Amino acid sequence: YFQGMAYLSIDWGSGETGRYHWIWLRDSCLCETCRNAFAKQKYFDSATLPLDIRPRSVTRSAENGLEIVWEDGHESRYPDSWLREHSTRWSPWSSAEVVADGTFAHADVMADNKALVGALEHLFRYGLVVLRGTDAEDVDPDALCSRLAGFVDRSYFGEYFDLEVLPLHTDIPYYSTPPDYQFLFGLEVNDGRTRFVDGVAAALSLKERDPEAFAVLTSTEVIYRAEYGDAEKIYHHQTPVIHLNNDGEVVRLVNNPTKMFFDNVPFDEVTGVYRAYSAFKALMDEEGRAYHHSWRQGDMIIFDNRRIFHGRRRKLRGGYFSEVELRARSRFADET
Amino acid sequence: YFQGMAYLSIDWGSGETGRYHWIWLRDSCLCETCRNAFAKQKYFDSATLPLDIRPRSVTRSAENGLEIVWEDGHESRYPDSWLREHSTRWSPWSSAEVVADGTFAHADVMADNKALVGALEHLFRYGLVVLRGTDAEDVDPDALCSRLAGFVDRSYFGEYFDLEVLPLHTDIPYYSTPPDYQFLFGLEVNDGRTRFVDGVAAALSLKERDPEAFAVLTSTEVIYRAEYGDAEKIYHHQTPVIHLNNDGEVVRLVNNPTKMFFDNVPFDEVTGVYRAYSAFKALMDEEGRAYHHSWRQGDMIIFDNRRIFHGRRRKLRGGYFSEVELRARSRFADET
Ligand SMILES: [Fe+3]
Ligand SMILES: [Fe+3]
Ligand SMILES: [Zn+2]
Ligand SMILES: [Zn+2]
């Protein structure tokens, strides 16, 4: 360090050059008065750092890396193996071809982090995965949820719900923010199939066949409502069936007909949305675009409740996963 | 009904006129083959209804209301007391004056629905409420959570966390979607105060004093990161401190300095965001805009984790509430 050196600039050889501001070097101090090495958490608010902070001394040894003494006397050490590290979504499917690639073996994702990461990444991108067990296996659903997400999304229902045994729907449309992902587990299966359609593909299909119904569905709000006196909850959400972002990408689909009400659509647009809605539903019922699942015991299908329509003495067990948690499990498994 | 009558139009007297399309009247049928009166849920998908459906007969008795026989022979009855019903957010606070109006008595909201509704509505609008008990009272936290939301938001921590006993922060910034609301409960209090600042007011304040720092903070992304090896979760979110919607309304604030990293800000913008961030934090530390709370036992403060910065042998118990659930409880309590 000479007085007035504007920032740190290191030549790593072969034209790789790192540049580091003093303010950020100060903010990044590794010492035990600045950050907890265990919790990797900071003890100060960056906001207090003196903006014009300069160092008094900058010394680099090949022995103990980069050592800085700041103007205020503080001392920081930076390993070169640290400075060099800093010198630097949805895919539609109009038909069930990509679901072969998205069937994984229970044992693999239970055992191997690369398989968990791989199955979760297929789920994030395509919105459905199938996790299949063997006969030698006796697949534990609580353990599989724990492997996937740590814990499930408690809802009005509880932690899980059972179906014992048909319009296509997404689930809980009356939540202003519905659960990200749903799972169905083959709790008890014998020796009529559940369908799965990508609403994103279907909505982009509809954009072409019928741009009118697309504009209507992406811009007219209907109502989803569920009264549940037992729990003292009325869930009431007014929202469009198809949601676009600021660039007109489909980013959510919301439809369960059984709680669907058109009561608040203006008189002159009512006929238009019944037509648009009926077009959309029919398009999805087309042979070709569903994936049909033959329920085997211990099967789990996890699917993106924001975009996959699904529909039906086997007994299934269902629940929901939060994107926050799946991604954090996937990120942990991938970086170890 | 005469053949070709385009829709239903009823004169309720005094110039009140209802208009009802046939398609929606069909969709709305009250009969037991169309909807479950108990679950108020529908048995069909609206999408199947024949769009050009007309009635064959429309008869209104003052005795049993409106009776329709549809072309396909279906029969529907509509009470006039049903047809007539269908013939038809955030507030900033730059200082703690509005928190007097937002202190409610535990007993009132526990007992009276109008008080629960009133306290929850103050929470939605202003982002903080205080629920205060008496000495005769022994306030139960689980019962108070149940009264407010039915259930709390399970998180990485669990259902609740304890603090036993300082930069201003919002909590869990490393969640891509952080919890909507947080609560702090006075579990064990004796006979140094927690501050509360509205980030929305502070951010609009900053827009005026320093539009540069506003633009920087609303457009430059920083990183919030929390590694938790015990739970096999790495939470990593890149996001701006101040979030605007398409009309430039502040709709979320995200900052806990202890997990905050600027590592991925471009070299040329680093100095700008340290300045902008430091301005923002300082503005909020100004005398006047905090609300300071004197912790009494059995107190609960519920506050909007999307916008209220807060900061510190008393022992507090904390957890999180979902907007979905609070609103559903408030809507249920208000409509009974
Ligand atoms: Fe379902
Ligand atoms: Fe906190
Ligand atoms: Zn240090
Ligand atoms: Zn009917």
Side-chain angles (χ1 to χ4, degrees), chain A residues 1-15 17-62 64-229 231-286 288-312 314-336, chain B residues 1-15 17-62 64-229 231-286 288-312 314-336:
Chain A
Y1 184 80
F2 69 95
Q3 194 55 233
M5 195 194 296
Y7 51 85
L8 191 73
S9 69
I10 299 175
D11 184 347
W12 303 103
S14 82
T17 300
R19 299 179 301 174
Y20 317 82
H21 279 293
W22 303 127
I23 191 43
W24 172 87
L25 281 172
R26 186 49 187 82
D27 190 27
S28 299
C29 178
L30 304 175
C31 88
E32 307 97 302
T33 65
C34 280
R35 55 174 293 275
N36 192 30
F38 185 50
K40 298 206 88 294
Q41 85 147 47
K42 285 168 77 172
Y43 289 127
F44 58 108
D45 195 342
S46 308
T48 77
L49 289 186
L51 302 187
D52 62 354
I53 179 74
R54 321 221 81 70
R56 217 160 49 203
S57 144
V58 178
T59 69
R60 177 149 154 243
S61 59
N64 287 335
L66 193 80
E67 292 189 344
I68 292 180
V69 167
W70 303 95
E71 273 183 321
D72 74 345
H74 199 85
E75 303 180 23
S76 310
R77 181 162 31 250
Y78 308 99
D80 296 354
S81 80
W82 180 96
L83 291 169
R84 209 190 289 97
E85 287 56 14
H86 292 100
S87 43
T88 298
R89 289 295 145 243
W90 282 357
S91 297
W93 49 277
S94 54
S95 55
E97 317 303 308
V98 318
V99 192
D101 310 73
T103 305
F104 293 77
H106 169 275
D108 280 52
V109 303
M110 285 305 250
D112 183 357
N113 282 1
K114 285 202 186 51
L116 173 57
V117 169
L120 281 175
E121 296 295 329
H122 195 261
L123 171 67
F124 300 144
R125 175 130 178 277
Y126 298 95
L128 182 156
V129 276
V130 187
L131 306 184
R132 273 265 176 73
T134 61
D135 289 71
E137 245 157 3
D138 216 16
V139 173
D140 181 39
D142 307 7
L144 189 48
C145 295
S146 268
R147 175 67 164 171
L148 290 169
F151 51 89
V152 315
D153 243 51
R154 214 274 194 214
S155 86
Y156 156 69
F157 305 130
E159 305 235 306
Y160 58 77
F161 56 84
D162 281 305
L163 309 180
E164 173 84 61
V165 304
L166 277 310
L168 286 179
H169 62 296
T170 64
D171 265 324
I172 316 196
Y174 43 83
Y175 269 25
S176 62
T177 297
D180 300 327
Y181 296 92
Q182 175 176 10
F183 67 81
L184 296 162
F185 185 74
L187 202 60
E188 294 157 26
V189 186
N190 264 3
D191 305 327
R193 282 187 317 170
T194 290
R195 317 121 68 187
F196 290 87
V197 190
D198 174 19
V200 173
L204 299 180
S205 199
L206 182 71
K207 195 176 170 191
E208 300 206 51
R209 315 235 278 252
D210 195 327
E212 175 60 19
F214 187 83
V216 169
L217 282 183
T218 51
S219 63
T220 311
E221 287 180 350
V222 296
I223 294 165
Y224 294 100
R225 191 184 169 90
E227 293 148 34
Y228 292 130
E232 293 173 79
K233 298 252 175 82
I234 299 182
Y235 296 104
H236 180 113
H237 191 46
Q238 172 157 332
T239 193
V241 170
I242 301 169
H243 293 216
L244 305 176
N245 68 2
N246 281 323
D247 299 293
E249 281 138 11
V250 172
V251 296
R252 171 183 300 173
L253 290 108
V254 186
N255 170 241
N256 185 335
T258 55
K259 335 282 175 197
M260 190 180 190
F261 299 79
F262 302 62
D263 298 8
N264 257 72
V265 181
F267 182 75
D268 282 331
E269 309 166 42
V270 163
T271 279
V273 329
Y274 275 104
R275 205 203 56 85
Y277 180 54
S278 205
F280 184 50
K281 272 323 198 47
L283 193 157
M284 292 196 307
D285 269 352
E286 283 180 358
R289 36 184 56 240
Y291 158 85
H292 299 75
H293 182 73
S294 317
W295 274 109
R296 302 218 283 246
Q297 165 113 1
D299 277 0
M300 199 156 75
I301 312 154
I302 312 103
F303 50 107
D304 191 326
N305 194 39
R306 300 157 308 189
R307 62 171 285 190
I308 267 72
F309 285 80
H310 75 271
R312 157 48 187 75
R314 98 200 168 188
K315 189 200 212 176
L316 298 184
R317 169 153 299 163
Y320 301 101
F321 289 130
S322 177
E323 176 136 85
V324 181
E325 304 301 349
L326 300 170
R327 286 231 173 240
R329 174 55 56 66
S330 172
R331 178 173 289 244
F332 174 90
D334 188 67
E335 286 180 14
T336 67
Chain B
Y1 184 80
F2 69 95
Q3 194 55 233
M5 195 194 296
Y7 51 85
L8 191 73
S9 69
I10 299 175
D11 184 347
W12 303 103
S14 82
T17 300
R19 299 179 301 174
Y20 317 82
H21 279 293
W22 303 127
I23 191 43
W24 172 87
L25 281 172
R26 186 49 187 82
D27 190 27
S28 299
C29 178
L30 304 175
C31 88
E32 307 97 302
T33 65
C34 280
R35 55 174 293 275
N36 192 30
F38 185 50
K40 298 206 88 294
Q41 85 147 47
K42 285 168 77 172
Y43 289 127
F44 58 108
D45 195 342
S46 308
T48 77
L49 289 186
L51 302 187
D52 62 354
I53 179 74
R54 321 221 81 70
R56 217 160 49 203
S57 144
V58 178
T59 69
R60 177 149 154 243
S61 59
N64 287 335
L66 193 80
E67 292 189 344
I68 292 180
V69 167
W70 303 95
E71 273 183 321
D72 74 345
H74 199 85
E75 303 180 23
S76 310
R77 181 162 31 250
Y78 308 99
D80 296 354
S81 80
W82 180 96
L83 291 169
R84 209 190 289 97
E85 287 56 14
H86 292 100
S87 43
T88 298
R89 289 295 145 243
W90 282 357
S91 297
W93 49 277
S94 54
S95 55
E97 317 303 308
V98 318
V99 192
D101 310 73
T103 305
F104 293 77
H106 169 275
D108 280 52
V109 303
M110 285 305 250
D112 183 357
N113 282 1
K114 285 202 186 51
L116 173 57
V117 169
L120 281 175
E121 296 295 329
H122 195 261
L123 171 67
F124 300 144
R125 175 130 178 277
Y126 298 95
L128 182 156
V129 276
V130 187
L131 306 184
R132 273 265 176 73
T134 61
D135 289 71
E137 245 157 3
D138 216 16
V139 173
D140 181 39
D142 307 7
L144 189 48
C145 295
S146 268
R147 175 67 164 171
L148 290 169
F151 51 89
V152 315
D153 243 51
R154 214 274 194 214
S155 86
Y156 156 69
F157 305 130
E159 305 235 306
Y160 58 77
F161 56 84
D162 281 305
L163 309 180
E164 173 84 61
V165 304
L166 277 310
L168 286 179
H169 62 296
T170 64
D171 265 324
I172 316 196
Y174 43 83
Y175 269 25
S176 62
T177 297
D180 300 327
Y181 296 92
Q182 175 176 10
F183 67 81
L184 296 162
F185 185 74
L187 202 60
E188 294 157 26
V189 186
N190 264 3
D191 305 327
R193 282 187 317 170
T194 290
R195 317 121 68 187
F196 290 87
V197 190
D198 174 19
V200 173
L204 299 180
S205 199
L206 182 71
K207 195 176 170 191
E208 300 206 51
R209 315 235 278 252
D210 195 327
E212 175 60 19
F214 187 83
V216 169
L217 282 183
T218 51
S219 63
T220 311
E221 287 180 350
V222 296
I223 294 165
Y224 294 100
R225 191 184 169 90
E227 293 148 34
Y228 292 130
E232 293 173 79
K233 298 252 175 82
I234 299 182
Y235 296 104
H236 180 113
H237 191 46
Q238 172 157 332
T239 193
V241 170
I242 301 169
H243 293 216
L244 305 176
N245 68 2
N246 281 323
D247 299 293
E249 281 138 11
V250 172
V251 296
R252 171 183 300 173
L253 290 108
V254 186
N255 170 241
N256 185 335
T258 55
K259 335 282 175 197
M260 190 180 190
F261 299 79
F262 302 62
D263 298 8
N264 257 72
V265 181
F267 182 75
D268 282 331
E269 309 166 42
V270 163
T271 279
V273 329
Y274 275 104
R275 205 203 56 85
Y277 180 54
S278 205
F280 184 50
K281 272 323 198 47
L283 193 157
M284 292 196 307
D285 269 352
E286 283 180 358
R289 36 184 56 240
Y291 158 85
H292 299 75
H293 182 73
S294 317
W295 274 109
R296 302 218 283 246
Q297 165 113 1
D299 277 0
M300 199 156 75
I301 312 154
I302 312 103
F303 50 107
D304 191 326
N305 194 39
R306 300 157 308 189
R307 62 171 285 190
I308 267 72
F309 285 80
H310 75 271
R312 157 48 187 75
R314 98 200 168 188
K315 189 200 212 176
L316 298 184
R317 169 153 299 163
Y320 301 101
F321 289 130
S322 177
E323 176 136 85
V324 181
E325 304 301 349
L326 300 170
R327 286 231 173 240
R329 174 55 56 66
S330 172
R331 178 173 289 244
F332 174 90
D334 188 67
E335 286 180 14
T336 67

